[PDB]
Amino acid sequence: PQSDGISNLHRIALRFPKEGGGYDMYRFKVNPENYTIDSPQRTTAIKTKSDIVIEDYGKDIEVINFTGTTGFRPVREADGLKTGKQK
Amino acid sequence: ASEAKQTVHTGNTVLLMIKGKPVGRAQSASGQREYGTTGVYEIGSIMPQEHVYLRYEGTITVERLRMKKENFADLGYASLGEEILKKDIIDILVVDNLTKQVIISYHGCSANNYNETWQTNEIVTEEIEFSYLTASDKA
Amino acid sequence: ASEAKQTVHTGNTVLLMIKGKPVGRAQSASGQREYGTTGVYEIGSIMPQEHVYLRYEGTITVERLRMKKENFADLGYASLGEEILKKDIIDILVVDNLTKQVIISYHGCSANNYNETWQTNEIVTEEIEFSYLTASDKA
Amino acid sequence: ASEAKQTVHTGNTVLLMIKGKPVGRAQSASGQREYGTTGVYEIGSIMPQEHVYLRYEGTITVERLRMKKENFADLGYASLGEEILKKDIIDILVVDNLTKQVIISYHGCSANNYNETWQTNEIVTEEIEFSYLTASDKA
Amino acid sequence: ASEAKQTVHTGNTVLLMIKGKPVGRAQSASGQREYGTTGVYEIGSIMPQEHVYLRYEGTITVERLRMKKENFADLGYASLGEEILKKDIIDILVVDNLTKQVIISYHGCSANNYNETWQTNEIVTEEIEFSYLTASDKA
Amino acid sequence: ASEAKQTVHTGNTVLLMIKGKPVGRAQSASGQREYGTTGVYEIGSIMPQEHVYLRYEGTITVERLRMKKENFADLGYASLGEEILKKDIIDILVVDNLTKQVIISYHGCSANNYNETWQTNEIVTEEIEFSYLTASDKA
Amino acid sequence: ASEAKQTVHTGNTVLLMIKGKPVGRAQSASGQREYGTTGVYEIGSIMPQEHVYLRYEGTITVERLRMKKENFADLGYASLGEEILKKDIIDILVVDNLTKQVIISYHGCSANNYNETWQTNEIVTEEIEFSYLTASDKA
Lengths: 87, 139, 139, 139, 139, 139, 139
Known about the structure:
part of a larger assembly; 7 chains; A: mainly beta; two-stranded antiparallel ribbon; about 0% helix; B: mainly beta; 8-stranded antiparallel β-sheet; 8 strands; about 40% strand; virus; bacteriophage; phage; contractile
């Protein structure tokens, strides 16, 4: 949920794979500043001498891109006290 | 009322010192600071998460009636033309007149500008707007 | 007319409390809170159809006459140089004199700019501008 | 001179109402509008062909002495921190004191800012700069 | 001295006529007309060799004390919301009191901004800013 | 003191002339000039090598009480709407009242704006801000 | 008190010398010299570690009451039109009245803007703004 006056903000988390199986849980302590998501389509257009032909092949590989800054002031961690540079 | 027994600084009880020497006929000594504070905004909430510092900025302005000798050029602080490159870090203090005890120091300064005015039936003045690295104090 | 019956708040019926202590010899405190409120416009219709809120731009300024000692910097609220670093978050409260009921409170302030002003003859004056995370109150 | 027989509004004969309730100790109630009018210029002539509207803009500012109770936070209009997202469209009227007849209405508002001042030997104030969608009137 | 012999126009010898009626209890009317005049410069010569005219930026402001009724909005010149839409072009004339000869005229005005101002105690004041297609006159 | 024997110009001893005709009830005649001077800076030194001129700019403002006849529209200088394109280079002088000897001339002008004010119990005025090519003088 | 013993410079003890002659009936002369001083910041540390100097932005303004003749333009310092061209570099000195010792000097001034001001009744006033290559002095 976003801050909507009904629930408090909940920030993004990355769950990386662990060498021996199972997973990490890297959660961001400041959320991104820019967040962009692209959804390209594989549709192509060819122009015949007397008509246009529209052809589609379905959904294409989506792209996720986002940008942000790690906080400055120290913030407690679920198993430590880690600063922004350590994060 | 009494000097030792008041508990606010009047301009009476403050000396202004610079290059280890008291100044005659100084007027104002305004010291302004900006720590460029601008907290991180964050998509998903309306309000800043923490307020954080982005660049120190320190200005001290001194204004003075122009004395016939020992003006800020004669005391060596101010200068005209290229000669400024020969100058070095000037040093400034604010002191208790009643005990000669430092209130604060400005531990490294340089001039921005050296404004001057002559006017009809008026007293001439120097003005200097120094920039400075840091300010500190002990005792 | 009397304190026990007047309907309006005044400079004499309020106390400004910082870190559990009353501020001495302030002159004014002023707070601006702006939500960056903006209307959402639309092609085909000239007028906006709702407002929305952008960033909680929240600030309080404190102007004060310099106590002979125990000023902000000396007592440990303002800072100079890389002292700004160490000065963790500070809390401020505006307090109703007789009962010391809360009027409003500022969870976690943070300095922006600090101005100490000396002038010919007159009393030394101090200015600080604080930005805070969230203002709040309880009765 | 007489109330029923003058033909100009003094601040005497105007009530200010908000959320269906009269306000105590309000001061100014300035309502400003901009219809972003900027007529089309056109190559081949010096002068605009017709003046046309590009975006409605409506601001109503209210300024008030801070009352001990039923301030604009207690009446629910203003608010501090995230809690604003819980708020809803406030509603404001300007009324004939002598007959309780509406002069104009502002049929949907939201706050921009909630400026406040405490000062030495002075009366405290609230200020609100509401933005609003539309204004209308009947009778 | 007398009206029948004075050489100068005054506030008392002029009437402001809008849509065929005299405006009541105005305070000031001021008109700016700027041609955007600009000089044409040249390589090799530092000074411009002619001026040319860009855009007829023409405006008149009207400031008025609020009549108890029949103000601009009530009588049907100013507007609110999507009423701005329907209010077709309006004409204004400045008129020489005795003869009601034309002084100047504004073919087709159009609103820009509308400001109604209430304040403690005092008379309510109104401001409107109009932009027009072409100013003109005949004797 | 005496007219022939003073050696400073009072507004008394100056006539203002325009299109070869003296003006009645003119007020101010401010003439401002900017030669866009901005000397060449140069990498390898702190200071400008020579100060050089980048664009001539000449403005003369005239302010006048609005006369009942022979206003700046009747004298043909000012104009309303498209009709300005029909106008031609106006010509202005500043003259010794005591001898009708030119002090300076403005040898080619055009209007920027034609600001006007009517106000309650006040004298009406014209204002013109002419731009001009060159200024010169002989004898 | 006396000229032979006072410690401060005043409008009455100074003479302004241009091209070897004293300026008559000036009102004020004011000079701004700014080095464009700027601090060099750094990643990882919030405060700047030295200042450096950019451009010698040096200026003097002269304001004067118009002498009946031999003003700046007439006597050959100010200029109009393509006269600016021919007016080679000019030198100015500020001079201590009794001894005519140098106070400060301006090697090679150059005009920026020239303003001649006529107004109803009052004395005609003149303004010139000069920019110079290097200010300097010798005792």
